[PDB]
Design an enzyme around this catalytic site. Structure first.
Site, PDB file in Angstrom:
ATOM      1  N   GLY A   1       0.815  -1.194   0.000  1.00  8.50           N
ATOM      2  CA  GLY A   1       0.000   0.000   0.000  1.00  8.50           C
ATOM      3  C   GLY A   1       0.853   1.249   0.000  1.00  8.50           C
ATOM      4  N   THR A   2       0.216   2.405  -0.173  1.00  4.91           N
ATOM      5  CA  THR A   2       0.906   3.673   0.001  1.00  4.91           C
ATOM      6  C   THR A   2       1.113   3.856   1.493  1.00  4.91           C
ATOM      7  OG1 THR A   2      -0.984   5.149   0.325  1.00  4.91           O
ATOM      8  CG2 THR A   2      -0.419   4.567  -1.945  1.00  4.91           C
ATOM      9  N   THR A   3       1.980   4.786   1.861  1.00  2.47           N
ATOM     10  CA  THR A   3       2.332   4.947   3.260  1.00  2.47           C
ATOM     11  C   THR A   3       1.416   5.977   3.955  1.00  2.47           C
ATOM     12  OG1 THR A   3       4.207   5.389   4.792  1.00  2.47           O
ATOM     13  CG2 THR A   3       4.211   6.527   2.665  1.00  2.47           C
TER      14      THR A   3
END
Ligand code: WPI
Ligand code: WPI
Lengths: 249, 244, 241, 222, 244, 196, 204, 232
Positions: free
Chosen positions: B30-32
Site C-alpha cells: 500500500g501507500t504509506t
C-alpha cells in the site's frame, strides 16, 4: 459465524469403516484406565487420577461424576469431551424425564439418551465424534443395579464388569477370573482396587485413584428430614481415607 | 504435509495463520500513512499517489472520520479500509445511542479489533488487507492506535504503515527522542508533512498529493478536522525545505 | 497426511493437530507468567516487553480485569487474548444478573473451557491460540488459580506458570512447595507475596527486572487489581536486600 | 391460604395451612403448600396452585443443574433471581405468590415474591387470603433474636390466625425449619387442631342394595 | 471455503450407484447375521450377537431384536445406535397412525415410511446414510403375517424368508433350499437355527450368542403375542433342536 | 411513595419513605427504595415495584459490563441506560425514576426520568405520589450548594410533609449520601420526623 | 359459554382396603339436549385407570394422547406405567397447555403393582394435583358428589362394600344434576382382577 | 498450477486476490468507452459492439437519475445489477431527503457494494467496469469504478479494449477540453475524437456510436443513431 459445514465428517470408506469413529475409539484406547464392577447390593466405578502437575490440585478435578442421585459416570478418553457430555446428560435427565414424570430416569434410559447424543456427533453436519467411552453405573426401583458402557459410536452394552482405556484387555481378563454373581459390594470394591493396582505405575493411594459406588441410600446426604419417601442418594464417591483404609487389605 | 496457507482459520504446524500473513503483504504494497500523537491531539497524514494528470486534486479523499472526534487512515486494499470504517461508524453510533457519551478511543479501538480478529476465525472469510491508523481525543486525553490484519492493535507515540513505513518509523523514532516532553499540534502537522515527503522515495517514479488531518483540544476543540488552505501549504513548504 | 491436519477431526492415531498447533501459537509472544497463592490473596506476574520505541508502554498488557473479583492473564497473541477477555467479561456479568451472585473463578474457567472444547469438536471454528489463567479470592474457596488451554482442559492450581520458559519456573516452584509442605505462600501481606513471586521469577528465569519489565496483578477479597510501575518499583527495591 | 416466614437467630422457618379451595368448596383438607426448591431452600405458595407448583419445580430443576455445574450449594438469592425473572416475563399471568426461605453458605434468608415479579425482604412475612390475620399476629408478637422454638411458635400461631379467622384457610399447620448448620427440618401436620368428630351413624349399605344391569371382568394384561 | 472437506455423501458413481450406500452395505455385511422366516402360524426372528464376553450381561442386553409395537418387531444389522434412532422414529409413526385412525398401523405403511426416511438421506442433506438393515416381522388384518427388509438405500422388499448381514448369500441359499409354504412355526424355528450354525464364523452356536423372538397366536385368543426369548429359553431350543 | 434526590456542595443525597402499598393495605412498611446500580450511582424507584426492580437489575448489569470494559461510567451514562429502557418500553412500564450520583469531575448530579422516558437534569428532583404536596415547600426551601447537614434537613422536612399528607407514603425516611468520602446510609424513624 | 358445562358428566374415585374404585356417568349432551347414553369417561392404560370429565372433544383427545404416551412408555421402559408416575405425566401434560388448556377434570385411580398400595388423584384443567387418600370428584355434579362422599365414605372398605358406597355416591349425586346421568359404570379394582358393573338408574 | 485463484476468500502469498484480478480482465476485454468533463458538462462516449452483422449493437450507457448516469465495459448483467442498485440509492436520496445524491457518494456506495463480493465465500466479484458522469451541487463530475471496489475521480478516462489510446490522448488534451464551458458539442467532439484513438480497424458508424451528456441546465440524456450522426 457462517457454518458452511452442513455435511457429515464421518462417512463410510469403501471397506465399510467409519473412519472417525475408529480414530475416536483409538483416542479412547490411549486414555487412562477406568473400570466398573457390579455386585448384588451395589456397583463400584474406579479410575486413576493422573495428575498433570503436582502443582495441580487433583481434588479440583473429579473424573467420576454424579448424573442423578442414583447414577454416576466415569470415562476413559478426552476429558473436555467427557465434561461436556456430563453436563448434557444431567440436563436431559431433567428436560426429558424429571420435568415429565417427577422421577429421575432409570439407568438404561439415561444411558440411551447419552448414546443418542453421541450417535448424533457421528452423523450431523460439521462435527467429529466424541473421543470418550463412558461407564455409567446406577440403580432404579424396577431394574435394580446396572452398569453400562457407551462408546463413541453411540453403541452401548450392559456389563457384569469391564474396563476401558489402556489396560482394558488385561483388566478385563483379570475380572472374569474374580467375578461371580454372589459378590457383595465390599468384595467388588476390593476387586476393583486390585485390578487398578496393575495398571497404576506410580503412587497408589486414596489420592491418586478415585472410587464411587451405587449402593444403599444415604439419608445423611439428603439434606432434609420430613418426607419418609425420600431416602437419599445411592451414588457415593469415596474419600482418600476410605480408600486408604481398604488398602490395608 | 502442505497447504496450510489455503484456508483462513488454519493453524500451521508452528502455530501461525498464513492467510493473515498474506494479507499483510497487501498492506505493505500500500501507500504509506502515519499518525503523530502530540500533547493535546493527533495528526494523520497519507501518501496519495498521482498516477496521472487526469486525477483531480484534491478530490480523492482517503482519511475518514468516525463520529465527530475520530480520524482513521489506512494503507493497503482501500475498499477493505472503507468497510472497516463503516463498521466503526455503526459501532460508534450504537455506543453513543446507549451511553450518551461519544465513544472513548480505546473502546473504539477494541471495537475494530474484535471485528478484524473475527475475520481470522472462519474459512468463510478472508482477513482485512489493511492496517489502520486511527485516533482522537476522548475524556482521557489524546490516543493514537494502529491495527493489523490479525486483529492486533496497540497505542502509539507515532505509527506508520505501507510502502514507506520504515523510513517513517526511523523519522518518528527520532522525534520521540528529541521531544520527550511533547510535540505541539501545529508542529506535529509540519513534521507529519516532512515524514510523508521522506517516505515518498520508495515510490519516487510517481508523483504524490498530500493529505493531513488533526483532532486537537486546542486547535480544533477536540473535533476531527482536515488541514486545508494556508496551514497545508505552510507544511508543504516546510517539507520541501528539509529535503534539501 | 490429510485434511485431518487442517480442521478439528481425528487423525488415524486419534489426535487433533489443530489443537496441538494452537498450543504452539500460545508461545509466539515469548512472554512468561507465573501465578501464586498467598494466605488471603493471589498474585499473577507476567513479563512485559515493549520492543518498539514508538509503542505506548501503558497499552501493552496481557493481564485483564474480568470482574470486580476475577483477573485473567493470557499467554498468547492479543487478538485471541482480547477476544477471550471480552467473552469472560460478558460471561461474568450475565452470570451475576441471572443468579444474583458474583461468578466464581473456577466456574468462569469451566465456562471458558467448555467454549474452548466446542472449537475442538466443530469444524467451522478454530481453537484460540491462548492459555488463560484465572485468579481471584473466591468467597467460598479462598485464593484460586484456574487455567484453561485450547484443548478445553481446566485445572485447579496451587501455583503455576506458563510460557516458553514454563518448565524452569514450574520446577522452581515444585521444589519450593516440596520443602514447604503447604500449598500456598504463608504470608499475610499481599506485597510480600508479590515479592516472593518476583523472586522465584528471577531465579528460574535467571534474569533481573526493572519496573518496566513486569506486570503484576493482585487478587484480594473482593478486589482484583494491577500494580503500576511504581508499586512494582517498591517491591523491586524491597527485594534487593 | 395462609403462608408465613419468620427469621430467627440461627435460621428461618416457614409455615402454611393445608386447605385447597375451589370457589367455596374445599377440595383438599390436607394440601401440602410447602415446596422444596433445593434441600435447604423451601417455598410456600399461594395463588393459582398449578402455577405455584409449576414455578417451584422448574426453578427447582434449574437450581439443581446450576448446583451440579458450579459444584456449589444452591443459594437463596439465586432461586430468588430466577423466580422473579420468570414471573416478570409473564406479566403476572403466572399467578404465583411465594415466600422463599433457606440457608446457604452465605447465611439465612427470607423473601417474598409476587406474580408480577416484585420481591421483598424482611424478618417476617405473610401472604394469602389469610395474609392479614397472620400479619396482625406477627406485628403483635415479633421481636428480634427469636430462638428456634420461639420462631416456630410465632409462625405457627400466625397460621392459626388465618385458619380460624379466614374462610380461605383451614385445617392443619405445616412447618419447615432450616437452621444454619443442620438439615432442613420438615414437619408435615405439625398441628392438627381440626379433626372431624365421629358421625352420628354409619352409612354402610347392606350388600345387594345397588341395582346392577351388567357384569364383566376387565382385561388388564395383554 | 469449506467445500474441499465435503465428501459429497449423496452422489452417483459413473455406474449410477450411490457410493455411500454401497459402502454402507459393505459395512452391514460385517454385522452379525439376522434371519426372518414366515410360517402359516407365525413368524420367527433369530439373530447372532457381535458382542460376546462371559462378563457381558445378557439378561438385560439387546442389539438385534426390537419391538416397534405389539404387532411389529424388527431385527437389526449394522450400527446399533443408527438403528436406535430409526426405531424410535418408527415407534412414533405407529402411534401417530393409531391416534389418527384408531387402528394399529398396517405393517407395510410403517415399513414404507421408515424406508422413505432412509432414502431421503441418499438424495439431499450431505449426511452419511444410516448403516442399518432391518428385517420387519409383523401382523395386520389385511395381509396377515408379513416379512420385509430395508437397507440404507431406501429399498424394501417382501419375503417368505430372508437374512441380513454377514454371510447372507450362504444363508439365502440354505433357506431357499429347505423352506416350504406349509412350514409350521416349530419347523421354522429349527430351520433358522440350522442356518445360523452353518453361517457363523464362530466355533458354534451357544445360547449366549443368540437373540430370538416369535410372533404367533396363543391358540386361545386369535390374538397376537410377541415373545422375545430369555437366555434360558434360547438354551432350551438349542438342546431341543439338537445343537446342545 | 415519596422520593427525592438533592445535590449539594460535597455531593448528593437520595431520600425515600419506606412504604409500599397494595390498595389501602400496607404490603411492606420497611421497603428500601434507594437502589444501588453502581458504587456511586444510585436511583430512587417509584411506580410498579416489579417494573422498577427489573429495570434497576438490568441497569446494574449494563453498568457492570460497562465498568469492566471502559472503567467507571458517568452519572449521565447511568441516566442514559435508564432512559433507553424506559423510553423504548414506554407502553409496558409504569416507572418513575430519579437517578443520582457522584464524580470528582462532576460532583453531585441528579436526573429525573418520568413516565415519558423523557430525561431531565435538575439541581434536585422530587417524585412519587407524595411529591405533589411538597412542590411548594421545596421550591421555597432549596438552596444550591447547601452543606451536608442543611441538605439532610431539607430532605427530612420535605419527606415528613409528603408522608404526612400522602397515605401512599410512610414508615421510615431512608437516605443515602454520595460524596468523595463515599457512601453513607441514613435512617429516620417516625417519632423523630413526625414531630417537626 | 362454560366449556366444562356444555357436555356434562361426572367421575368419582375412592380408596378402600387393598382396592380402589372409580365410577362415571354415561351421559353426553349438548346443553339441554341429550345426545348419547353410551359415552364412557373411564379409560385404562395397563392397570392405570384414568377418568376424564369436561368438554367431550378434549376428553377424547386426552385419552388418545395418553394412549400414545403410555405406549411409548411401555416400549422404552419395558414395564407398564405406575399410578404415581402417570399422575405426574397427566399434570405435566395439562400444564403444557397452560395458556390454552384442555377443558377437563381428570381423575387417576389404581394399585401400585410393586408397592401394592391403592392410589387416587385429581387435577384441574392445568395440572395442579389433588393428592387425596379418600376420594376424588370431578364434573358438573362435583358439589353433590362432595356432599355425598363426605357422608357416605368410611376408610378401609372391603371391595363388595366400597362398590355399594361408590355407586350410591354416584347415583344420587347425578340425580341432582341436570347435566349428568343416563347410566353409570363402576370399576372395582384389585391387584388380581378388575370388575366392571353397569348400574341401573332413572333415564331422565 | 495456481492454488490461490479458486475463490475470493483466498489471498496469494504475494498478497493478491486472483479472482478479483480475473474479473478486471473481463473489462479489459469489454468494448471501449470514454468519459470527460469541463466545469459545466460531462460526456460519456461509448463504442458499441455487435455480435454478427445481423445483430443489434449492445447498449453501453445507462441513466441512473436525471442528474447522473454511467457507461459499462465488461459483464453487462452485472452492470444492470449495479446501475439498478444505484438507481435506488438515488431514488431513496430524493424521496427521503428531497436531495439529489452527490456523485462522489454514488462512488462510495458502489465501492462498498463491490467490496462485499470480494470477502465472502461463494460470492464472486463484479465482472464490469463503470464510468459515472453526473452534475450535482459541486458541478460536473466523472468517476471510474473498477470491481476491485476502487472508485476514482478524474477529468477524463477510458476503460475496456484498447482504452490506452484515448487515455493518453486525454492527458495531452487535458488543459484544452477542461475549458469547454457552455458548449456541449465541442465537449463531445473532443470525446468522440479520443475514442478514435482506440479504433483498431472498424470506424464509428451511426449504429456503433452511443453518447450521453449531462451538466448545468442539461439533464442526463442518451444519443444514439441519427442523433449522433452530426459528430461522425
Ligand atoms: C388501577 O390502579 C390501582 C390499582 C390498585 C390495586 C388493585 C388491586 C391490587 C392487586 N391484587 C388484588 C388482590 C388479589 N391478589 C392476590 C394475593 C394472594 C391470594 C391469596 C390466595 C387466595 C386463595 O383463595 C381465594 C387461594 O386459593 C385458590 C390461594 O392459593 C393457594 C391464594 C394480589 C393482587 C390500587 C389503586 O389504588 C387504590 C390503584 O389506583 C387507582
Ligand atoms: C409513588 O409511587 C406511586 C406511583 C404511581 C404512578 C405514577 C404515575 C401517574 C400516571 N399518570 C398521571 C400523570 C398524567 N397523565 C396524563 C395527563 C392527563 C392530561 C390529558 C392530556 C391528553 C393529551 O393528549 C392529546 C394532551 O396533549 C395535547 C394533553 O396536554 C398536556 C393532556 C397520565 C398518567 C401511583 C401511586 O399510587 C397513587 C404511587 O404510590 C405508591
Amino acid at each position: 459465524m457462517t457454518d458452511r459445514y452442513s455435511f457429515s465428517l464421518t462417512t463410510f470408506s469403501p471397506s465399510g469403516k467409519l473412519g472417525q469413529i475408529d480414530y475416536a475409539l483409538t483416542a479412547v484406547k490411549q486414555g487412562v484406565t477406568s473400570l466398573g464392577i457390579k455386585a448384588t447390593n451395589g456397583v463400584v466405578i474406579a479410575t486413576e487420577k493422573k495428575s498433570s502437575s503436582p502443582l495441580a490440585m487433583s481434588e479440583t478435578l473429579s473424573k467420576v461424576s454424579l448424573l442423578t442421585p442414583d447414577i454416576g459416570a466415569v470415562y476413559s478418553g478426552m476429558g473436555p469431551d467427557y465434561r461436556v457430555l456430563v453436563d448434557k446428560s444431567r440436563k436431559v435427565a431433567h428436560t426429558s424425564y424429571k420435568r415429565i414424570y417427577g422421577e429421575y430416569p432409570p439407568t438404561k434410559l439415561l444411558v440411551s439418551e447419552v448414546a443418542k447424543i453421541m450417535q448424533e456427533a457421528t452423523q450431523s453436519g460439521g462435527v467429529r465424534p466424541f473421543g470418550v467411552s463412558l461407564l455409567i453405573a446406577g440403580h432404579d426401583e424396577f431394574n435394580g443395579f446396572s452398569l453400562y458402557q457407551v462408546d463413541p459410536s453411540g453403541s452401548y452394552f450392559p456389563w457384569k464388569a469391564t474396563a476401558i482405556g489402556k489396560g482394558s484387555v488385561a483388566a478385563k481378563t483379570f475380572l472374569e477370573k474374580r467375578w461371580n454373581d454372589e459378590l457383595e459390594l465390599e468384595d467388588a470394591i476390593h476387586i476393583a482396587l486390585l485390578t487398578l493396582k496393575e495398571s497404576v505405575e506410580g503412587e497408589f493411594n486414596g489420592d491418586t485413584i478415585e472410587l464411587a459406588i451405587i449402593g444403599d441410600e444415604n439419608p445423611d446426604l439428603l439434606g432434609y428430614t420430613g418426607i419418609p419417601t425420600d431416602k437419599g442418594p445411592r451414588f457415593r464417591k469415596l474419600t482418600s481415607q476410605e480408600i486408604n483404609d481398604r488398602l490395608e487389605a | 504435509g502442505t497447504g496450510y496457507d489455503l484456508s483462513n482459520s488454519v493453524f500451521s504446524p508452528d502455530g501461525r495463520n498464513f492467510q493473515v500473513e498474506y494479507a499483510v503483504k497487501a498492506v505493505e504494497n500500500g501507500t504509506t500513512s502515519i499518525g503523530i500523537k502530540c500533547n493535546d491531539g493527533v495528526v494523520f497524514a497519507v501518501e496519495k499517489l498521482i498516477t496521472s494528470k487526469l486525477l483531480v486534486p484534491q478530490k480523492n479523499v482517503k482519511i475518514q472520520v468516525v463520529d465527530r472526534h475520530i480520524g482513521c487512515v489506512y494503507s493497503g486494499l482501500i475498499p477493505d479500509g472503507r468497510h472497516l470504517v463503516n463498521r466503526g461508524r455503526e459501532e460508534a453510533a450504537s455506543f453513543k445511542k446507549l451511553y450518551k457519551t461519544p465513544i472513548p478511543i480505546p473502546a473504539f479501538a477494541d471495537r475494530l479489533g474484535q471485528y478484524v480478529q473475527a475475520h481470522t476465525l472462519y474459512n468463510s472469510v478472508r482477513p482485512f488487507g489493511v492496517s489502520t491508523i486511527f485516533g482522537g481525543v476522548d475524556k482521557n486525553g489524546a490516543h493514537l492506535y494502529m491495527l493489523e490484519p490479525s486483529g492486533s492493535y496497540w497505542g502509539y507515540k507515532g505509527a506508520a504503515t505501507g510502502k514507506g513505513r520504515q523510513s517513517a518509523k526511523a523519522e518518528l523514532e527520532k522525534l520521540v527522542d528529541h521531544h520527550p516532553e511533547g510535540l505541539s499540534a501545529r508542529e506535529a502537522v509540519k513534521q507529519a508533512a516532512k515524514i510523508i515527503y521522506l517516505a515518498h522515495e520508495d515510490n519516487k517514479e510517481k508523483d504524490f498529493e498530500l493529505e493531513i488531518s488533526w483532532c486537537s483540544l486546542s486547535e480544533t476543540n477536540g473535533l476531527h478536522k482536515f488541514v486545508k488552505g494556508d496551514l497545508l501549504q505552510e507544511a508543504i513548504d516546510f517539507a520541501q525545505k528539509e529535503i534539501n | 497426511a490429510g485434511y485431518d491436519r487442517h480442521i478439528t477431526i481425528f487423525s488415524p492415531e486419534g489426535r487433533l493437530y489443530q489443537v496441538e498447533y494452537a498450543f504452539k501459537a500460545t508461545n509466539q509472544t515469548n512472554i512468561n507468567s507465573l501465578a501464586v497463592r498467598g494466605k488471603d490473596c493471589t498474585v499473577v506476574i507476567s513479563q512485559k516487553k515493549v520492543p518498539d520505541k514508538l509503542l505506548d508502554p501503558t497499552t501493552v498488557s496481557y493481564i485483564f480485569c474480568i470482574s470486580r473479583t476475577i483477573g485473567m492473564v493470557v499467554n498468547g497473541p492479543i487478538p485471541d487474548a482480547r477476544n477471550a477477555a471480552l467473552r469472560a467479561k460478558a460471561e461474568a456479568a450475565e452470570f451475576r444478573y441471572k443468579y444474583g451472585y458474583d461468578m466464581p473463578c473456577d466456574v468462569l474457567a469451566k465456562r471458558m473451557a467448555n467454549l474452548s472444547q466446542i472449537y475442538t469438536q466443530r469444524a467451522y471454528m478454530r481453537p484460540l491460540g491462548v492459555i488463560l489463567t484465572f485468579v481471584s479470592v473466591d468467597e467460598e474457596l479462598g485464593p484460586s488459580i484456574y487455567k484453561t488451554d485450547p484443548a478445553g482442559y481446566y485445572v485447579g492450581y496451587k501455583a503455576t506458570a506458563t510460557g516458553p520458559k514454563q518448565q524452569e519456573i514450574t520446577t522452581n516452584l515444585e521444589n519450593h512447595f516440596k520443602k514447604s509442605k503447604i500449598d500456598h505462600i504463608n504470608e499475610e501481606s499481599w506485597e510480600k507475596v508479590v515479592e516472593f513471586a518476583i523472586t522465584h521469577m528471577i531465579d528460574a528465569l535467571g534474569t533481573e527486572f526493572s519496573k518496566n519489565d513486569l506486570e503484576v496483578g493482585v487478587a484480594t477479597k473482593d478486589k482484583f487489581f494491577t500494580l503500576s510501575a511504581e508499586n512494582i518499583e517498591e517491591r523491586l527495591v524491597a527485594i534487593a536486600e | 391460604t395462609t403462608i408465613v416466614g419468620v427469621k430467627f437467630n440461627n435460621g428461618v422457618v416457614i409455615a402454611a395451612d393445608t386447605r385447597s379451595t375451589q370457589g367455596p368448596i374445599v377440595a383438599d383438607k390436607n394440601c401440602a403448600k410447602l415446596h422444596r426448591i433445593s434441600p435447604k431452600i423451601w417455598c410456600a405458595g399461594a395463588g393459582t396452585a398449578a402455577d405455584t407448583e409449576a414455578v417451584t419445580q422448574l426453578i427447582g430443576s434449574n437450581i439443581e443443574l446450576h448446583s451440579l455445574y458450579t459444584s456449589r450449594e444452591p443459594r437463596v438469592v439465586s432461586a430468588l433471581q430466577m423466580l422473579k425473572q420468570h414471573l416478570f416475563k409473564y406479566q403476572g399471568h403466572i399467578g404465583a405468590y411465594l415466600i422463599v426461605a433457606g440457608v446457604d453458605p452465605t447465611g439465612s434468608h427470607l423473601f417474598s415474591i409476587h406474580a408480577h415479579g416484585s420481591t421483598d425482604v424482611g424478618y417476617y412475612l405473610s401472604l394469602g387470603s389469610g395474609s392479614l390475620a397472620a400479619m396482625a399476629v406477627l406485628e403483635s408478637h415479633w421481636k428480634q433474636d427469636l430462638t428456634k422454638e420461639e420462631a416456630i411458635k410465632l409462625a405457627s400461631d400466625a397460621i392459626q390466625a388465618g385458619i380460624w379467622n379466614d374462610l380461605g384457610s383451614g385445617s392443619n399447620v405445616d412447618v419447615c425449619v432450616m437452621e444454619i448448620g443442620k438439615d432442613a427440618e420438615y414437619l408435615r401436620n405439625y398441628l392438627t387442631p381440626n379433626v372431624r368428630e365421629e358421625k352420628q351413624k354409619s352409612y354402610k349399605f347392606p350388600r345387594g342394595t345397588t341395582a346392577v344391569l351388567k357384569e364383566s371382568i376387565v382385561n388388564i394384561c395383554d | 471455503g469449506s467445500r474441499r472437506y465435503d465428501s459429497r455423501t449423496t452422489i452417483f458413481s459413473p455406474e449410477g450407484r450411490l457410493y455411500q450406500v454401497e459402502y454402507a452395505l459393505e459395512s452391514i455385511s460385517h454385522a452379525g447375521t439376522a434371519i426372518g422366516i414366515m410360517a402359516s402360524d407365525g413368524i420367527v426372528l433369530a439373530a447372532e450377537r457381535k458382542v460376546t464376553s462371559t462378563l457381558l450381561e445378557q439378561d438385560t442386553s439387546t442389539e438385534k431384536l426390537y419391538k416397534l409395537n405389539d404387532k411389529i418387531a424388527v431385527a437389526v444389522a449394522g450400527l446399533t445406535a443408527d438403528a436406535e434412532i430409526l426405531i424410535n422414529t418408527a415407534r412414533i409413526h405407529a402411534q401417530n397412525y393409531l391416534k389418527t385412525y384408531n387402528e394399529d398401523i398396517p405393517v407395510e405403511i410403517l415399513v414404507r415410511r421408515l424406508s422413505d426416511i432412509k432414502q431421503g438421506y441418499t438424495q439431499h442433506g450431505g449426511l452419511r446414510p444410516f448403516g442399518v438393515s432391518f428385517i420387519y416381522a409383523g401382523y395386520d388384518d389385511r395381509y396377515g403375517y408379513q416379512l420385509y427388509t430395508s437397507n440404507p438405500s431406501g429399498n424394501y422388499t417382501g419375503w417368505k424368508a430372508i437374512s441380513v448381514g454377514a454371510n447372507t448369500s450362504a444363508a439365502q441359499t440354505l433357506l431357499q433350499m429347505d423352506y416350504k409354504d406349509d412350514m409350521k412355526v416349530d419347523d421354522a424355528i429349527e430351520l433358522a437355527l440350522k442356518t445360523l450354525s452353518k453361517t457363523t464364523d464362530s466355533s458354534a452356536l451357544t445360547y449366549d450368542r443368540l437373540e430370538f423372538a416369535t410372533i404367533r397366536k396363543g391358540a386361545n385368543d386369535g390374538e397376537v403375542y410377541q415373545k422375545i426369548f430369555k437366555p434360558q429359553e434360547i438354551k432350551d431350543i438349542l438342546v431341543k433342536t439338537g445343537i446342545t | 411513595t415519596s422520593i427525592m434526590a438533592v445535590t449539594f456542595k460535597d455531593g448528593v443525597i437520595l431520600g425515600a419513605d419506606s412504604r409500599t402499598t397494595t390498595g389501602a393495605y400496607i404490603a411492606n412498611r420497611v421497603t428500601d427504595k434507594l437502589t444501588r446500580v453502581h458504587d456511586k450511582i444510585w436511583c430512587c424507584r417509584s411506580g410498579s415495584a416489579a417494573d422498577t426492580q427489573a429495570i434497576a437489575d438490568i441497569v446494574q448489569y449494563h453498568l457492570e459490563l460497562y465498568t469492566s470494559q471502559y472503567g467507571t461510567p458517568s452519572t449521565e451514562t447511568a441516566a442514559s441506560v435508564f432512559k433507553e429502557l424506559c423510553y423504548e418500553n414506554k407502553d409496558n412500564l409504569t416507572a418513575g425514576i430519579i437517578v443520582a450520583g457522584y464524580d470528582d469531575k462532576n460532583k453531585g448530579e441528579v436526573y429525573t426520568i418520568p413516565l415519558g422516558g423523557s430525561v431531565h437534569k435538575l439541581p434536585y428532583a422530587i417524585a412519587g405520589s407524595g411529591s405533589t404536596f411538597i412542590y411548594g415547600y421545596c421550591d421555597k426551601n432549596f438552596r444550591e450548594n447547601m452543606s451536608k447537614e442543611e441538605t439532610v434537613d431539607f430532605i427530612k422536612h420535605s419527606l415528613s410533609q409528603a408522608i404526612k399528607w400522602d397515605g401512599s407514603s410512610g414508615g421510615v425516611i431512608r437516605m443515602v449520601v454520595l460524596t468523595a468520602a463515599g457512601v453513607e446510609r441514613l435512617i429516620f424513624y417516625p417519632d423523630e420526623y413526625e414531630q417537626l | 359459554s362454560d366449556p366444562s358445562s356444555i357436555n356434562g358428566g361426572i367421575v368419582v374415585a375412592m380408596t378402600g382396603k387393598d382396592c380402589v374404585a372409580i365410577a362415571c356417568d354415561l351421559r353426553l349432551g349438548s346443553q339441554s339436549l341429550g345426545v348419547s347414553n353410551k359415552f364412557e369417561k373411564i379409560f385404562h392404560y395397563g392397570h392405570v385407570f384414568l377418568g376424564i370429565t369436561g368438554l367431550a372433544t378434549d376428553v377424547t383427545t386426552l385419552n388418545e394422547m395418553f394412549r400414545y404416551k403410555t405406549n411409548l412408555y411401555k416400549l422404552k421402559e419395558e414395564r407398564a406405567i405406575e399410578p404415581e408416575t402417570f399422575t405426574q405425566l397427566v399434570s405435566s401434560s395439562l400444564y403444557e397447555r397452560r395458556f390454552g388448556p384442555y377443558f377437563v377434570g381428570p381423575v387417576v385411580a389404581g394399585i401400585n403393582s410393586k408397592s401394592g398400595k391403592p392410589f387416587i388423584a385429581g387435577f384441574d384443567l392445568i395440572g395442579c394435583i389433588d393428592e387425596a387418600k379418600d376420594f376424588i370428584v370431578s364434573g358438573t355434579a362435583s358439589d353433590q358428589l362432595f356432599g355425598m362422599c363426605e357422608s357416605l365414605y368410611e376408610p378401609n372398605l372391603e371391595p363388595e362394600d366400597l362398590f355399594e358406597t361408590i355407586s350410591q355416591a354416584l347415583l344420587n349425586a347425578a340425580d341432582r344434576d341436570a347435566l349428568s346421568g343416563w347410566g353409570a359404570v363402576v370399576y372395582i379394582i384389585k391387584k388380581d382382577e378388575v370388575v366392571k358393573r353397569y348400574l341401573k338408574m332413572r333415564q331422565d | 498450477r495456481n492454488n490461490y485463484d479458486g475463490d475470493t476468500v483466498t489471498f496469494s502469498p504475494t498478497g493478491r486476490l486472483f479472482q478479483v484480478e480475473y474479473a478486471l480482465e473481463a473489462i479489459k476485454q469489454g468494448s471501449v468507452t470514454v468519459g470527460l468533463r469541463s466545469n459545466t458538462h460531462a460526456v460519456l462516449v461509448a463504442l458499441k459492439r455487435n455480435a454478427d452483422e445481423l445483430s443489434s449493437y449492445q447498449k453501453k450507457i445507462i441513466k441512473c437519475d436525471e442528474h447522473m448516469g454511467l457507461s459499462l465495459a465488461g459483464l453487462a448483467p452485472d452492470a444492470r445489477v449495479l446501475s439498478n442498485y444505484l438507481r435506488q440509492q438515488c431514488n431513496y436520496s430524493s424521496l427521503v431527503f428531497n436531495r439529489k445524491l452527490a456523485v462522489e457518494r454514488a462512488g462510495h456506495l458502489l465501492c462498498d457494494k463491490a467490496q462485499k463480493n470480494t470477502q465472502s465465500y461463494g460470492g464472486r466479484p463484479y465482472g464490469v467496469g463503470l464510468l459515472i458522469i453526473g452534475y450535482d451541487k459541486s458541478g460536473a463530475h466523472l468517476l471510474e469504478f473498477q470491481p476491485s471496489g476502487n472508485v476514482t475521480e478524474l477529468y477524463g478516462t477510458a476503460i475496456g479494449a484498447r482504452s490506452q489510446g484515448a487515455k493518453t490522448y486525454l492527458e495531452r488534451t487535458l488543459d484544452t477540453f477542461i475549458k469547454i464551458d457552455g458548449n456541449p458539442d465541442e465537449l463531445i467532439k473532443a470525446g468522440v475524437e479520443a475514442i478514435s484513438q482506440s479504433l483498431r480497424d472498424e470506424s464509428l458508424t451511426v449504429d456503433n456510436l452511443s453518447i450521453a451528456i449531462v451538466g448545468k441546465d442539461t439533464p442526463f440524456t442518451i444519443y444514439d443513431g441519427e442523433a449522433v450522426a452530426k459528430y461522425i
